[PDB]
Ligand binder design. Structure first.
Ligand code: NA
Ligand code: NA
Length: 327
DNA sequence: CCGACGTCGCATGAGC
DNA sequence: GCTGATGCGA
DNA sequence: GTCGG
């Protein structure tokens, strides 16, 4: 619903969330504030009091108090104070650079490094990932229009097939669900020659070809099963250059591919709902396999999966389009 | 009261 | 130089 | 910070 409903509250909780991750380094508190921010962001009424919000799952006593304070005063004293905190706001800011987490950011600010320009003056203290993150700080914070994602998909699917026409490639994430914009490109890759009960170069040569035609421009990380890096659409001649994007490519065993596609398609809320059905039906679904319990709860061997629908079939639920997997 | 809160590949440091 | 923990991102 | 065993 309209941000004007409870935007101040959700923004406040989101701010508090970020400080718990990046500054307090308390990851579970961060997820709590986000869970509260989300359940409120889906609430179709302008909240009148903290008690009204406390009814919602994810909102407890402390946030109810904070909502009371915000509603009455228009702000939150603890948030206002940490905003002005030069050390804390600087630590929180540096973590926006990909590769710089809470630990690196605190180390930087300790030794007087607070800003992007500070990072620029100090390259030899940055690792390879962080340098890329610094290099593309702005572009990485931009979202990717679906039209560009399609143009990116065209290039990925084409070069992948050109390497070996037996490769199977699927762009997952919210893009596969039909989102009008994406944050990055998540590619899932497989080959009939690759199963669980069974080359080290299946991933390399796909990455290699995408570098060869200058789609992939940088590499954050690269192993035998997982690639994380940077890509860029070809500049339409004299038209303004496209922003560099984040792209992940992972090689999954064929017998685990469709459990992988299902999981990385999402949504998170949908996955939660989905593998909670499965439990009530005697099956355990994770990222890799679907397995059966189990009179006492001993999970048996992974069931054969040749498609997404195959998984739906096991747990007696009808196949639902990626379009309709918001929850 | 008090533990769970996802899990893991890769890069990198520490430990030895 | 080998083993394993840590930081990071997803 | 919240939930739940
Ligand atoms: Na609640
Ligand atoms: Na970061």
């Amino acid at each position: 619903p309209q941000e004007t409903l409870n935007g101040g509250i959700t923004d406040m909780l989101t701010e508090l969330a970020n400080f718990e991750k990046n500054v307090s380094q308390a990851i579970h508190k961060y997820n709590a504030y986000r869970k509260a921010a989300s359940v409120i962001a889906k609430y179709p009424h302008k909240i009148k009091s903290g008690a009204e919000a406390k009814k919602l799952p994810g909102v407890g006593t402390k946030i109810a108090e904070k909502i009371d304070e915000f509603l009455a005063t228009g702000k939150l004293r603890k948030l206002e104070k940490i905003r002005q905190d030069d050390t804390s706001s600087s630590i929180n800011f540096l973590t926006r650079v990909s590769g710089i987490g809470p630990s690196a950011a605190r180390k930087f600010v300790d030794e007087g490094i607070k800003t992007l320009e500070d990072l620029r003056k100090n390259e030899d203290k940055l690792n390879h990932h962080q340098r890329i993150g610094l290099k593309y700080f702005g572009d990485f914070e931009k979202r990717i229009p679906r039209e560009e994602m399609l143009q990116m998909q065209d290039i990925v699917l084409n070069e992948v097939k050109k390497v070996d026409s037996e490769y199977i490639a699927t762009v997952c994430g919210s893009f596969r669900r039909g989102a009008e914009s994406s944050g990055d490109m998540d590619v899932l890759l497989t080959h009939p020659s690759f199963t669980s009960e069974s080359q080290p170069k299946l991933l390399h040569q796909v990455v290699e070809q995408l570098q060869k035609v200058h789609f992939i421009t940088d590499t954050l990380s690269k192993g035998e099963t997982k690639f994380m890096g940077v890509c860029q659409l070809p500049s339409k001649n004299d038209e303004k250059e496209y922003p560099h994007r984040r792209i992940d490519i992972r090689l999954i065993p064929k017998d685990q591919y469709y459990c992988g596609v299902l999981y990385f398609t999402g949504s998170d809320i949908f996955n939660k709902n989905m593998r909670a059905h499965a439990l009530e039906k005697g099956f355990t679904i994770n990222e890799y396999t679907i397995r059966p319990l189990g009179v006492t709860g001993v999970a048996g061997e992974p069931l054969p999966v040749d498609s997404e629908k195959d998984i739906f079939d096991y747990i007696q639920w009808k196949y639902r389009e990626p379009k309709d997997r918001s929850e």
